[PDB]
């Protein structure tokens, strides 16, 4: 008796599971279940060769923007140096020896780096040369460049804001949300703390200059009660004057996806907050967020902060924007989600839609919504929890001063300050919300308008005046054209051409009934698959990287790729040729089911779980996914992979026979 | 990736109880909880010295005793050669190539090896006691493969005994071996589902024609051999089977290796059989079973069964009180408790109670064939009377239990097949085992109870116990065994219920606030030889850590087992918990589900699964003594309270949200 054969078979499949070559011979001949892919267009050396022309030429492309000579930072006020924090933790000090430090003082220096090749093969493999190359030339992953980053701030720092009329009452209306799904913030600080999520390996932000997660002590058990200390004896100042760092932020460039021909006038900045700050403001914010009301939930509301597209909200977005009336006499259904807005109304009784784009909107968010913001949400909490309204309110104060004025580096030791409490610190937490309220209250005042007898603000010349005199906002020309709706699309068509959070929204067929399901060109998943946002890396190995392809291409299906024909076959393709022990191996990701997908937005958590690491996504499952409770397997790529691994499959053998 | 910070801090922890080099440097300062201990005798150089010497001369001593002659293997019936087994599995045979293969015959190597155990735990008995009696304890017993000579001279002692065909009725065998019929396992299931609930170990030998671990071989076991001898039980098609692939029935006779007596090696090396893995699994699901269902001694006075007995949780006063119950000789019933080859006897003589532990001599040589065939229809019988939809079924395994009981062919060395010339004689190692002996016993122990109710009251006194054994059982009691003690009916705080020991342990009372508990005991010397025997070999890539960490592993399961209760032997063990590095203490262990392997000794519990609290807690005497209070639990100890603080280096601080500011 030491365990039972149930349990000892048990152990094998988890071992037998991490032995790719012990998969690769017990998966041969075994029956495969084959996505609908593409024909081959070229062999492995063509495609290869080609990608690596392109590759070759972006990485030219990007050396050249990357050597262009940048503006100066005299748009920016100049505060001098900061000391390197000296506090210490136990047998170390917060700030790490050796780092971030020039002879005393905080420094930083920016990553432009010049360094994909894989899926762009992939691409090549299976896809029209032409097209394939065409695309892949536009759009590159990239660090960006100094030229585009000091332009990009100084774009957001320097604009003339209008400070917005609002009022608790108003956000109310705009905003509702439910109180009692309130964190209740009256409760012990470290066990609030404790409960906000963030991610692991970004930067802790000074004084850490270490990963969140390796930094997660020394935040909790010394920095963060030190902070307590002093937000409650009101003695911020002392604590601020004698350790500067505990304040200071890091302006970045954002590696991103950019355009290649924009690469020396766009890389965007952002901001990282120290590791104290940002998990105690996220008490509020996470919060808030957690509690708020959707557009489709409740027809006051702007916020579209929230949606997601599975499970029915597809077709909730169309229902909720049924809804709008025509202009002058009835409301229209506006719908904000941080810069992004989808605006309905009728025009003699015809749907449109309208999709304009803001063009640098943190810039725009001007002080007065900040505070507002602030105010409303905490507002929320002392109003359900009252016996903790001091002390959030204080936090308050340091959440508007973090998305306003807090200082910051951005390369050696010269410490800056935006000159204007107008504009978004773009990074502090709630950047989205802030965002989605400038947005919400320039909107509402343009539908207030429209009641006014307005009616040429339906018009693109109108409406980008208007936004810009009354609420500092930039429309984008060309972004404002109403689009005539399909209000019940047929079986494969779309509700319009204009996309919404990055999708477009199109009906398909289940069974005989319609399904509201997301929607691209081809062109646009193909930009998405051949710029995967990571780097060269040596330690990832042959088998990662071709896993790497595997949950990519059942990433991109499920987010709608799969409705695309030709975007369709490629992510199929990969499927189909990625080996059968790189299918079934075990996997961390996802808790072991597989790397979700890299779209934010398909459920409201924003975690996405596959069933298992080893099916693929048909047409039917990610069908079943968009229809509201109307259940899917997810088909095994190897039906038999189970007992195939274990080499055992159960014959039933009867005890009672007759002998 | 983007997680709760409650979450990142426990998946930190985790990170932090496998970094060795971290977690030395977060527990440097750390507050230690010393368990009670004896004092260093020598340093490092010469306990280490010292240990090599005991080694050196144990090697010695192995290595001669391996080179003396064996006798002629003579006395067994010899079966000729059997082929290898063809049988192919999906894309490989289920006797592995090139493998126990000699031209195309199956063949075996008895390995007699000269390397003994390790000296780690000897040098630390050197560093922390006596230094002639640690030595004159080392040189008494090594843990060893035995030898060829003591191999065989057992091996023929045990199939050429004349035995004494018992009387025995399922009758009798209801009246002694009394069982629960509604926790019979349910074996009108589906066997699949019945053999997959059996336990056996992972790493034991799959017998042929595997030639591999259990754990290796259970795919083929299951998937493969095993419907095909279904397909031919439910046939009456045996024989078409054995005929063909006759290594499906061979079994392998191994020496045991084992703690053996130095003086006695080239005497005395323990046999047993290794059988093929379909056939253990298959009966086992009778044999796992019916332990299952038995009743015990404490629990149905009738009973002479103590196979399941354990001493935890009031189990040793159990065994106590129900010892009390025995009457005076030839008027009233004696106690009499049998496990295994293992008795404990308690019969009143002018009303003081007595307690006799004689031992057999290698009792399974003694077990006859007509008792082994009873407990075969006693255990199926039991299954088909609950369960009467599978009897055929059953029936026929239980044919095979018998013949792999006393009469499998059988490897040695080469590929000689032999076969036992008589029925007679229980071939150990052949699931049942312990069943099988302890019903031999209590078998004779009834009948020598009933000699003493006809008043025989003679049959008290080893002289005439030895003539009875042998002459109506064909049981040898060792010369000496048979020696009747006072029993001390209510010890004292500290005092033992006799000095002699059953299932390897004394019976003692000890103090746990102000009532008496029953514990296991042993004297300092017994532990000893215990600690400085460990039943490992050296192993090349064993780490120092590894080894330190066994160490503290090996002293917490010897405290468990009742070494705490002997106050030379606590200190010994406490002594190393103490001096175990702090990152061995506390870092992430594997064993025990990962709280520490648990004790070495089996019958703690019944089920036999002994789980520690706590990796880095260590078995305090408070701890200990609750094991076997009746309810009482305690917390165990930790070494480190303030460790997982430590290593998270975080500590709760709370901070007010409701204040005025
Ligand atoms: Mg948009
Ligand atoms: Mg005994």
Redesign the interface.
């Given at each position: 008796?030491?365990?039972?054969?149930?349990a000892?078979?048990a152990?094998?499949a988890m071992v037998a599971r991490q032995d790719l070559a012990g998969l690769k011979?017990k998966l041969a001949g075994a029956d495969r279940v084959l996505a609908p892919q593409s024909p081959e267009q070229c062999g492995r050396e063509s495609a290869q060769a080609q990608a690596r022309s392109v590759t070759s030429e972006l990485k030219s492309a990007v050396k050249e923007a990357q050597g262009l000579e940048h503006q100066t930072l005299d748009f920016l006020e100049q505060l001098g140096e900061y000391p390197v924090c000296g506090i210490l933790?136990?047998?170390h000090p917060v700030h790490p020896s050796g780092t971030h430090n020039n002879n005393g003082k905080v420094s930083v220096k920016r990553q432009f780096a010049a360094g994909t090749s894989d899926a762009l093969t992939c691409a090549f493999r299976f896809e029209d040369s032409d097209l394939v190359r065409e695309t892949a030339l536009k759009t590159t992953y990239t660090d960006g460049t100094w030229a585009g980053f000091v332009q990009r701030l100084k774009m957001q720092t320097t604009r003339k804001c209008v400070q917005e009329k609002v009022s608790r009452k108003l956000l109310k209306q705009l905003f509702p949300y439910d109180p009692q799904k309130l964190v209740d913030?009256?409760?012990?600080?470290?066990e609030?703390?404790?409960?906000?999520?963030?991610?692991?390996?970004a930067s802790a932000g000074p004084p850490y200059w270490r990963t969140?997660?390796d930094a997660?002590?020394?935040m909790?058990?010394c920095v963060?009660?030190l902070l307590?200390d002093h937000?409650?004896?009101?003695d911020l100042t002392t604590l601020r004057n004698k350790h500067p760092e505990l304040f200071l932020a890091e302006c970045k460039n954002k590696t991103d996806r950019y355009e290649v021909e924009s690469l020396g006038e766009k890389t965007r900045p952002y901001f990282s907050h120290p590791f104290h700050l940002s998990?105690l403001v996220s008490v509020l914010s996470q919060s808030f967020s957690g509690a708020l009301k959707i557009m489709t939930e409740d027809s006051t509301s702007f916020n579209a902060y929230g949606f997601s597209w599975t499970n029915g909200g597809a077709e909730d977005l169309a229902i909720w924007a049924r809804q709008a009336g025509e202009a002058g006499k009835k409301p229209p259904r506006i719908a904000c989600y941080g810069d992004d807005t989808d605006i309905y109304y009728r025009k003699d009784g015809k749907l449109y839609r309208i999709c304009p784009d803001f063009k640098q909107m943190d810039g725009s968010v001007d002080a007065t919504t900040i505070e507002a913001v602030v105010d409303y949400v905490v507002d929320a909490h002392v109003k359900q929890y009252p016996?903790?309204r001091?002390?959030?309110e204080?936090v308050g104060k340091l959440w508007v001063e973090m998305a306003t004025q807090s200082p910051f580096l951005i390369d050696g030791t010269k410490v800056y300050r935006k000159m204007q409490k107008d504009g978004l610190m773009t990074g502090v937490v709630g950047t989205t919300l802030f965002d989605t309220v400038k947005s919400a209250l320039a909107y509402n005042d343009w539908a207030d308008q429209l009641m006014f007898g307005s009616l040429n603000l339906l018009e693109e010349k109108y409406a980008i005046e208007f936004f810009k005199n009354k609420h500092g906002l930039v429309i984008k020309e060309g972004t404002w054209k109403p689009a005539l709706v399909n209000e019940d699309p047929g079986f494969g068509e779309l509700w319009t051409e204009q996309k919404f959070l990055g999708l477009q929204l199109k009906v398909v067929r289940r069974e005989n009934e319609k399904v509201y399901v997301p929607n691209l060109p081809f062109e646009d998943w193909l930009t998405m698959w051949v710029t995967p946002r990571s780097k060269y890396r040596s330690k990832e190995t042959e088998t990662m990287r071709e896993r790497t392809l595997f949950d990519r291409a059942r990433g991109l299906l499920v987010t709608g790729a799969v409705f695309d024909e030709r975007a369709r076959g490629l992510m199929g393709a990969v499927i189909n040729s990625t080996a059968p022990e790189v299918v079934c191996m075990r996997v961390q990701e996802g808790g072991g089911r597989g790397a979700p997908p890299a779209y934010a937005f398909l459920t409201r958590d924003?975690?996405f779980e596959f069933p298992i690491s080893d099916g693929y996504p048909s047409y039917d499952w990610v069908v079943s996914l968009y229809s509201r409770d109307h259940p899917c397997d997810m088909p095994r790529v190897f039906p038999e992979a189970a007992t195939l691994i274990?080499?055992?499959?159960?014959?039933?053998?009867?005890?009672?026979?007759?002998?």
């Open positions: 008796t030491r365990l039972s054969l149930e000892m078979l152990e094998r011979r933790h136990g047998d913030v009256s409760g012990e600080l470290s609030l703390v404790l409960g906000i999520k963030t991610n692991a390996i969140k997660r997660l002590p020394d909790l058990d963060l009660p307590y937000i409650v004896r009101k998990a016996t903790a001091q002390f959030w204080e924003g975690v274990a080499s055992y499959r159960k014959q039933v053998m009867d005890t009672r026979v007759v002998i």
